[PDB]
Design a protein around this motif. Structure first.
Motif, short mmCIF file in Angstrom:
data_model
loop_
_atom_site.label_atom_id
_atom_site.label_comp_id
_atom_site.label_asym_id
_atom_site.label_seq_id
_atom_site.Cartn_x
_atom_site.Cartn_y
_atom_site.Cartn_z
N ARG A 1 37.61 50.58 29.98
CA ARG A 1 37.15 51.95 30.07
C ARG A 1 36.84 52.57 28.71
NH1 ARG A 1 38.51 48.98 34.32
NH2 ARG A 1 37.04 49.80 35.87
N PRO B 1 38.54 49.34 46.42
CA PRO B 1 37.84 50.61 46.61
C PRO B 1 38.77 51.80 46.80
CG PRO B 1 37.72 49.32 48.61
CD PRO B 1 38.40 48.45 47.59
N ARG C 1 41.56 51.67 43.53
CA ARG C 1 40.77 51.78 42.31
C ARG C 1 41.33 50.93 41.17
NH1 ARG C 1 37.76 57.01 42.89
NH2 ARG C 1 38.34 57.94 40.88
N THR D 1 31.17 51.07 49.24
CA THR D 1 32.39 51.70 48.75
C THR D 1 32.24 52.29 47.36
OG1 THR D 1 33.21 49.59 47.90
CG2 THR D 1 33.79 50.17 50.16
N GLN E 1 34.22 59.61 49.20
CA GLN E 1 34.80 58.37 49.69
C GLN E 1 35.81 58.70 50.78
OE1 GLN E 1 37.49 56.03 47.33
NE2 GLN E 1 36.36 54.14 47.73
N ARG F 1 37.91 61.88 49.30
CA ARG F 1 38.01 62.28 47.91
C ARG F 1 36.64 62.25 47.26
NH1 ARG F 1 41.40 56.82 46.15
NH2 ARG F 1 39.60 55.40 46.21
N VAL G 1 34.62 60.77 44.49
CA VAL G 1 34.53 59.68 43.55
C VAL G 1 33.29 59.91 42.70
CG1 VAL G 1 35.71 58.12 45.13
CG2 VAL G 1 33.21 58.20 45.12
N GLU H 1 33.04 54.69 36.36
CA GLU H 1 34.22 54.02 36.86
C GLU H 1 35.37 54.12 35.87
OE1 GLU H 1 33.72 49.86 37.42
OE2 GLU H 1 35.46 49.63 38.74
#
Lengths: 48, 79, 126, 99, 136, 182, 49
Positions: D56, D84, D87, E25, E35, E130, E132, E136
């Motif tokens: 990240r 999914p 996470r 997804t 999501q 939620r 999303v 990421e």
RNA sequence: UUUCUUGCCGGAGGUAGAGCUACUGGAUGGCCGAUGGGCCCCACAGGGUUACUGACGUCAGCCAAACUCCGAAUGCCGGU
RNA sequence: UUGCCUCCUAAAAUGUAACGGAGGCGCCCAAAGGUUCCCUCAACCUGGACGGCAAUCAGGUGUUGAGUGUAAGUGCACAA
RNA sequence: GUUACGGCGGUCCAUAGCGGCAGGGAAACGCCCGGUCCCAUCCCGAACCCGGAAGCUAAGCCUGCCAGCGCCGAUGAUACUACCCAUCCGGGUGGAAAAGUAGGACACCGCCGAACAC
């Protein structure tokens, strides 16, 4: 080449109007045809 | 107010009857099927209704030829 | 810059001949007791070959290529007759009396029939 | 142009499989497989927190120096299996990057 | 509304509400997404309500994607009818939604407005959901 | 021995001319005209099936061999067609007869065409074959104009070993086909 | 009707040997066909009764 | 002990799972680019002009019980 | 609605119910049966007066597509 | 014993196909010319036969190389799942799926015939 089912086919001679001769096989049984213009005298082929 | 459905034929009990390795007698039915999902291999015939049956005694084997599944009979060594 | 476009008649004939040969082979196959007489007939020569499709191994073979068949004069049919006689003799030698005849995807009207009859009179069941 | 490869300790996996991977994730280590032109897939466990932080902070295309029991191997994160819902990084496919 | 142009079979078995979503997804179209976190038969009316809520919150700009399509017919028999006498006629059009499925996606310059619009949609929806994001 | 006019011309001059123009890496690329197919599609046979007999007779007299009667592989209701209805006649000419028919078609028929201004040389297949359509059927002496029945738009096509439009046009010009150069 | 159960009988043994269906419309005339007469022990012409 | 349990071996499946540009029914984009309506150049030759109804195709993305390019686990049939 | 056939339900052997989801039926074929042999286009171009969404047609590849007495599993340029 | 020479036959029939680039005729496989000769066209010597070498490897054939399209494709992980544990959650043991990248591959053997030198 089949025997008789095939229609007759005899060699023939043709003379045009300008006086050009031609020999080829065609269904015509007479063997002597008189063509008028032909490609040796047609205007399109000759010119213009 | 009712349902237009409700009909169904008898289950024809198709499928493989003798699987791989099973020793069968000549003329034994090996596969009950519609069409040639399996094709007659070696020492195996194809019945009128696509029933694969053994033509010779032996053990059932399943092979693949030209991408088509086949049922063959492998002769069994005499004891 | 020339690029062929049409499928040549040679290629069409090869593909169709293989097609017919496989069609025949669906039912005709060679075995040790009853081999398969495969025939390859070209515009120049004719060849025949006794195959055992179980092993894929040939027991006997004959060809018009041979100096003997070439010395034999006459016609393509005469040479095919000589080839048929030769393969019949060689099948006798190999111990093969009855076979199945694979015409290779051909017709009566040529050398295949002549070779077949040559083997007939020779003594092979074909 | 380039950047310093990110240092990550990636211990080899004594035990592999569904249960092993789930236990490693519970411990907090994302399982990974390092393969590539060397033709030698190795089964590693990267510290989940450090690996995710590297990913990240420098992105998926971030070159990583994996300390695999002392040895250092360069590799790029070829693929990331991420759940999914949770996470979390389920699994990492690492590709060796010879220098 | 969202209704299939046609369905090969109009009286289908209930979609199996099991497992997490295996596809769809992640945010693949917009910047933000909604999501799902529970299984539900999200109906075409709920989809319409959610998308209208998003569009009316974002007003002028922005783009909305509706990843799920309600192409599954849930049937209903006529009222005050006993059990039996066939299966009911198609009544609702639902999309089989599973946890992890992204139902709506939104692109909008203002992050706060985008999240508020997605919150509107979630409140219209019948499940936990939620916000999303693509990042990421 | 005997040899058609166009066939002898092709065997003696045309091959060399084409080689010189489109120099080929090998002699076998020299385009050589192949079967000539002449067709009469009736279309209205669904209303008057009798026209098939007249088409058969005309094609026979024109070509020299019986025309094969071609039925329909489809049944489209729009034109009242059913599977098997004789819908056209086809003659394939190969060899000496092909060359002689080409020679006659170039030396007799096309000049006799009414108000003949040639056909554009754009109807080539794009792979070496040339198709066109005669506006009538009386141009052939075998089809005497005094005993004709109706007009049949006569489809003709010549199949060549050419590779494309260029070699096809070169071959047909060498054979001496009229062309409305444009 | 339509496809009656016609009976094929031999010409020589004159035995009604077979029974088979035939579409009377497509084949109105008696179905003459070569079949096996067991009484004769050989194939003989059979025709519809 | 032919029964059954376990191990191993041989076997056919199309279920669970997915995958669908692999078929049969779907989905946001732009694309050489279909009727192109529309400006028209002013050709009725012939052609750009497409704000908008948007062909095939294509791009990551998604579903199915009567979908399957795939495809288990078990179960089952045999042998040991 | 009642018998028979096909599919799904049916949970990958077989079998499996409901006034569960879909359909067929109960004929037809003497040349659509047997055998022997052979084949061969699903769609763009050039076009092919008329004859474009179609002719009789010609080529290329579409690679096994495509379509194929009457719904699933089969049969293809090894041709059911 | 060998050849870019031949046919015949070879696999749980694409790792083999499609496409692109380059190469070969002593003998085979072909290409090809006219219908006196069997035979054939639902018409056509185009498919099948006759005499061939005046001429040719253009194509088929096969050889080498390209991973572009197709094909095969792991390990790992996940999905799923048998059994078991678990009050609603979930977990353990065992088995274990396509895509992709890592990748494989432009296929893999015997019989006989020709010339080469022995």
């Amino acid at each position: 080449m089949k025997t008789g089912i095939h229609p007759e086919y005899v060699d023939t001679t043709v003379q045009c109007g300008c006086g050009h001769s031609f020999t080829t096989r065609s269904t015509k049984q007479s063997g002597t045809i008189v063509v008028e213009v032909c490609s040796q005298c047609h205007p399109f082929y000759t010119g213009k | 107010s009712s349902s237009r459905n409700g009909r169904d034929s008898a289950a024809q009990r198709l499928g493989v009857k003798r699987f791989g390795g099973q020793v069968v007698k000549a003329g034994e039915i090996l596969v009950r099927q519609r069409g040639t999902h399996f094709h007659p291999g070696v020492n195996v015939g194809r019945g009128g209704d696509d029933t694969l049956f053994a033509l010779a005694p032996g053990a059932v084997e399943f092979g693949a030829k030209r991408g088509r599944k086949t049922v063959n009979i492998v002769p069994v060594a005499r004891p | 810059a020339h690029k062929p476009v049409g499928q040549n008649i040679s290629e069409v004939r090869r593909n169709a001949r293989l097609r017919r040969h496989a069609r025949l082979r669906k039912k005709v196959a060679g075995t040790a007791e009853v081999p398969r007489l495969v025939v390859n007939r070209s515009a120049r020569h004719i060849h025949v070959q006794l195959v055992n499709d179980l092993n894929g191994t040939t027991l006997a073979a004959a060809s018009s290529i041979e100096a003997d068949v070439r010395a034999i004069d006459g016609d393509k049919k005469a040479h095919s007759v000589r080839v048929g006689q030769l393969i019949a003799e060689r099948a006798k030698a190999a111990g093969v009396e009855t076979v199945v005849f694979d015409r290779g995807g051909y017709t009566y009207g040529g050398r295949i029939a002549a070779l077949a009859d040559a083997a007939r009179e020779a003594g092979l069941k074909f | 142009t380039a950047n310093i490869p990110n240092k990550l300790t990636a211990n080899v996996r004594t035990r592999t499989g569904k249960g092993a991977s789930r236990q490693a994730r519970r411990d907090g280590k994302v399982p990974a497989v390092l393969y590539g032109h060397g033709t030698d897939p190795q089964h590693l466990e990267l510290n989940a927190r450090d690996f995710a932080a590297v990913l990240r902070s420098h992105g998926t295309n971030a070159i990583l120096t994996l300390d695999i029991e002392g040895t250092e191997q360069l590799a790029l994160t070829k693929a990331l299996d991420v759940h999914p819902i949770r996470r979390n990084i389920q699994h990492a496919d690492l590709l060796v990057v010879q220098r | 509304m969202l209704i299939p142009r046609k369905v090969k079979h109009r009286k289908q078995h209930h979609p199996e509400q099991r497992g997490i979503a295996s596809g769809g997804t992640s945010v693949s179209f917009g910047d933000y997404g909604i999501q799902a976190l529970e299984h539900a038969y999200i109906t075409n009316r709920q989809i319409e309500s959610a998308r209208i809520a998003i569009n009316r919150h974002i007003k002028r700009g922005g783009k909305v994607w509706i990843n799920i399509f309600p192409d599954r017919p849930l049937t209903k028999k006529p009222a005050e009818t006993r059990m039996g006498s066939g299966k009911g006629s198609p009544e609702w059009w639902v999309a089989n939604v599973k946890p992890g499925r992204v139902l709506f996606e939104l692109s909008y310059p203002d992050e706060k407005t985008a999240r508020d619009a997605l919150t509107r949609a979630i409140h219209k929806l019948p499940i936990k959901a939620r916000i999303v994001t693509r990042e990421e | 021995k005997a040899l058609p006019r166009l066939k002898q011309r092709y065997r003696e001059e045309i091959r060399e001319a084409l080689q010189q123009e489109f120099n080929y890496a090998n002699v076998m690329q020299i385009p050589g005209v192949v079967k000539v197919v002449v067709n009469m599609g009736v279309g209205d046979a669904a209303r008057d099936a009798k026209l098939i007999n007249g088409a058969i007779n005309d094609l026979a007299l024109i070509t020299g061999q019986k025309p094969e009667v071609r039925r329909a592989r489809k049944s489209i209701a729009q034109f009242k067609l059913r599977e098997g209805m004789p819908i056209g006649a086809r003659v394939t000419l190969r060899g000496d007869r092909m060359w002689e028919f080409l020679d006659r078609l170039i030396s007799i028929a096309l000049p006799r065409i009414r108000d003949f201004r040639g056909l554009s040389p754009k109807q080539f297949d794009g792979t070496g074959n040339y198709t066109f359509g005669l506006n009538e059927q009386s141009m052939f002496h075998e089809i005497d104009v005094d005993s004709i029945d109706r007009p049949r738009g006569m489809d003709i096509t010549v199949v060549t070993t050419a590779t494309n439009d260029a070699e096809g046009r070169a071959l047909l010009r060498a054979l001496g086909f009229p062309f409305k150069e444009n | 009707d339509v496809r009656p159960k016609i009976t094929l009988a031999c010409e020589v043994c004159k035995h009604r040997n077979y029974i088979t269906k035939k579409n009377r419309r497509n084949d109105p005339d008696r179905l003459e066909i070569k079949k096996f007469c067991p009484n004769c022990g050989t194939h003989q012409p059979h025709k519809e009764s």
